[PDB]
Amino acid sequence: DAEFRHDSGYEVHHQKLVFFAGDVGSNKGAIIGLMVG
Amino acid sequence: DAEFRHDSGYEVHHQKLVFFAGDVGSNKGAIIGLMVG
Amino acid sequence: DAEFRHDSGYEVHHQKLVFFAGDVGSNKGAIIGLMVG
Amino acid sequence: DAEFRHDSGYEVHHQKLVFFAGDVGSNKGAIIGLMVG
Amino acid sequence: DAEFRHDSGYEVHHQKLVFFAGDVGSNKGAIIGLMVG
Amino acid sequence: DAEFRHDSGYEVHHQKLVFFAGDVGSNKGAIIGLMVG
């Protein structure tokens, strides 16, 4: 009687003034904050 | 009697002044904040 | 008597002044904040 | 005289017998191949 | 006279018998190949 | 006269019998190949 189990568990985030936040994987692009000429 | 289980679990986010937020996977593009000429 | 279960769980988001927010997968485009000439 | 340019470029994919393929932002779910009881 | 440029460039993929392939941002889930009871 | 440039460059991939392939940001889950009871 093979039992299995998993739990990705409890998280919590409190953020403020955050230009970017999260997970990406691949970026061939340009996550620019501000350009000027 | 093979039992299984999973739980992606409890989360919470409190954000403010956040130009971008979340998950992407792939970006071949251009996540620009501001361009000027 | 094989039991299974899943729960994608409880979330909550409170946001303000957020140019973009959410999940994308693929971007071949251009998520521009502001262009000027 | 401000020139810009971008090119997400040229790609090619040849696949076979591929249970899943592509880009995902977030998965709180269960991309299972096969369950049995 | 401010010039800019970008090029995410030229790619090629040839695959076969690939249970999963691509880019992921976040997985709170379960990308299982095969479960049995 | 401020010039800039970028080039994410030229790539090539030739694969076969590859259970998983690509880029991941976060995994709180379970990228299992095969479970048995």
Numbering used by the authors:
A (entry chain B), B (entry chain B), C (entry chain B), D (entry chain A), E (entry chain A), F (entry chain A): 1 to 37
Original authors' sentences:
The Arctic mutation, encoding E693G in the amyloid precursor protein (APP) gene [E22G in amyloid-β (Aβ)], causes dominantly inherited Alzheimer’s disease. In summary, we report the structures of Aβ filaments from a case of AD with the Arctic mutation and from mouse knock-in line AppNL−G−F. These findings have implications for our understanding of AD pathophysiology. Comparison of local conformations in this region revealed the presence of additional hydrogen bonds between adjacent Aβ molecules in mutant protofilaments; these hydrogen bonds cannot form in wild-type protofilaments, providing a plausible explanation for the increased fibrillogenesis of E22G Aβ. Mutation E22G may have an additional fibrillation-promoting effect, which is the relief of electrostatic repulsion as a result of removal of the negatively charged carboxylic group of E22; in the wild-type structure, E22 is trapped in close proximity to the carboxylic group of D23.
We also determined the cryo-EM structure of Aβ filaments from the brains of AppNL−G−F mice to 3.5 Å resolution. Filaments are made of two identical S-shaped mutant protofilaments that extend from D1 to G37 of Aβ. Each protofilament consists of five β-strands that extend from residues 1 to 8, 10 to 16, 17 to 19, 30 to 32 and 34 to 36. Additional densities around K16 may be co-factors or post-translational modifications of mutant Aβ, but their chemical identity remains unknown. The N-terminal segment (residues D1–F19) is longer than in human Arctic folds A and B, allowing it to fold back on the common substructure and extend across the dimeric interface towards the other protofilament. Both protofilaments pack against each other with pseudo-21 symmetry. The central portion of their interface is made of residues D23, G25 and S26 from both protofilaments and resembles the doublet-forming interface of human Arctic protofilaments A and B. At the edges, both protofilaments pack against each other through the hydrophobic side chains of A2 and F4 from one protofilament and A30, I32 and M35 from the other. In addition, there are salt bridges between E11 and K28, and close contacts of the side chains of H6 and S8 with the backbone atoms of G29 and K28, respectively. It shares the substructure F20–G37 with human Arctic folds A and B, in which the backbone conformation of the loop F20–V24 differs from human Arctic folds in that the orientation of the peptide group between A21 and G22 is reversed. Flipping the peptide group does not affect its ability to form additional hydrogen bonds with other Aβ molecules, but places G22 in the glycine-only quadrant of the Ramachandran plot.
